[PDB]
Amino acid sequence: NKPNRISPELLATCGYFMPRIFFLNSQYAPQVHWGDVVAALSHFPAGNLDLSSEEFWYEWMINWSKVGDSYINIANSAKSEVSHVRALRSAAACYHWAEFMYFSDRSRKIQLREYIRSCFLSSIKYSDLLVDHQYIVVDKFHMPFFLIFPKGYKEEENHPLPCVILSNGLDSMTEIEILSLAEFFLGKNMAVAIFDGPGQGINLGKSPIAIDMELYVSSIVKLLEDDARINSNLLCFLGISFGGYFALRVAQRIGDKFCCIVNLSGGPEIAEFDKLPRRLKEDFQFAFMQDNSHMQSIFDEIKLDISLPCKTKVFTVHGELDDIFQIDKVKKLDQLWGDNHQLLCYESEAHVCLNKINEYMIQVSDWVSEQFWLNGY
């Protein structure tokens, strides 16, 4: 017999996604172990190596679902709460990687995100963090909302805290990548606000993603203004990916509500829809609940007027080799926005600069703390 291993062909093919799958070493957010990737890919069918093909991502979903199922079995039989929670977190991570680039069964994708959300709410019960979970009603939309306080937080022993609002990207899950980013701010004794806007988190495939997400961010700001535990004069908005695009929108429309805004590899406009690589066409189609023929028009509407003023301090992290948000458009925005925009550009990094995420989140978290200090914290 040969030891369980990932095929050389497969591991190389998946190189772009391995930094995404491992993401950030986290205390609360679900995260895979190397062994989970081996469990998912060790029996992956050979001759199936096309990242743009529906058949690849079907087998990916099936194989990652099996690893998630194995962790639920461990969770169900766990002899302690601490063991139960670790198994649930592992299951949630596996189900996320099963679903994040799978679009061909809407009901199956929604089912997997519901599994993750169920695992998350169960993890909160046994956690040592204060989580305020509620719906924010925006017009007819009931927005899932999580206000999370730092370890050992007591309202009676604290002044009002600074708060970072973090947005999902196109294919992130709120309790996975976003909670992972959020831990950098929780670690610095800041509150964090994470949320499921239309077409985001648990709403992906249920409601179309809203281009004007700043409308939903405004409703979060009003909640934080009313909450005595939060210093509404010390607010940051952070977006990753498409969420970074929302970060640029927030900067233009409601920037004066924020001490600073962080844009993790969002841009003022997306590359031509027709020529998008890998599964990105189906990804954008699924998020917007639209077909191929309607997407370039949406991209045209998405494109920002970079002449419109930036109303706060913006920090952008971007890769020179980003094929979704081209660096030239970000650099054009950087020059135009001038003293109010700082660009950290990684010369040999692809979209989201995920080989640098540990180092840049250290730098980003310290930069946000600095902006709060500059506003008299």
Place this chain on the structure above:
Amino acid sequence: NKPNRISPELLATCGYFMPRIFFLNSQYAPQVHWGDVVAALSHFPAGNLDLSSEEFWYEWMINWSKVGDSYINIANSAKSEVSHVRALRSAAACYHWAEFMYFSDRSRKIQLREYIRSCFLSSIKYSDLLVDHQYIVVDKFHMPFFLIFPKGYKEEENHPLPCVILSNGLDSMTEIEILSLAEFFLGKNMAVAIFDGPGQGINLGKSPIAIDMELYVSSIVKLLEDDARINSNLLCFLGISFGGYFALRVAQRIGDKFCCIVNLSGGPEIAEFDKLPRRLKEDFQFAFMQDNSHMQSIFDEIKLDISLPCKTKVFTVHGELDDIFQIDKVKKLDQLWGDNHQLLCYESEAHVCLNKINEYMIQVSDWVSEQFWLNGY
């Protein structure tokens, strides 16, 4: 330009070691991110793919040292203690993977382990764990010793705690792999005792590793007997690898001091020295501070008398395809030791079953809790 990536040839070649390098997702123990492996291997010289060659592990040490240096630079410039500690942990992990399979410069290897230990002691200052660091004097040997208490531990608000003593393997570092394992017991409100015996941790390359490590474990037991904070009637010994061999020795010589013992892929005897794969000959040579010609005699002395009685409950985790501690010898011990020995055997796993470490440490930690409960906890 092309994005920074690990060569397909290199990633496949290193398959055996990738589960070791990632190890366990940990809160305190230093751990790499995927991006750190990319930083180490993205500019690794081509045509250098022999895991048994001195030249491969030299370039490995050089390239991992560069990533460690980068994190020390981040640590030195960090604007917060939380950022400082995260950078130090990342540096420590990188320096460990630089040194763990590098033996050709004794002074350089010792220097890298000193860097790790310096980073660790600095991390303790800012940590939320009570660490009792001292020397245990055994004869003329001054043994580095760490007694670590669970999160939020107060002697006044607790009964005497159970304690797990964990041993290094041949090439582990105490604050990396062993602290990673230890977190499973800290999570269950147990004390943990981690230590640098002769030829272990900081002493690797300074003093020859002691075959009779149980002598040093006895001195830890006496300390725990004297400490009012520890319930000396609720003690576990866990060893990984060669440390698992020590676990079997402890079971035979001082088992009656322990409610239970865990053997993570140790065995009663090692495979023929001459035919050991990869860098294992140089690994054993370095640990024992002996040349090739003397090692088979040491292996002959190492071999246990499995007829000698097992004096407590033993749990062994072992891979069918282990090429260092052959499964046949473990299964022979399992049958002989009978009701006092439990074997978890993974059919398609290599040495230490590292593709299963998350799931088996959940099972192992729950098993240890169960043994304490059976002894009236």
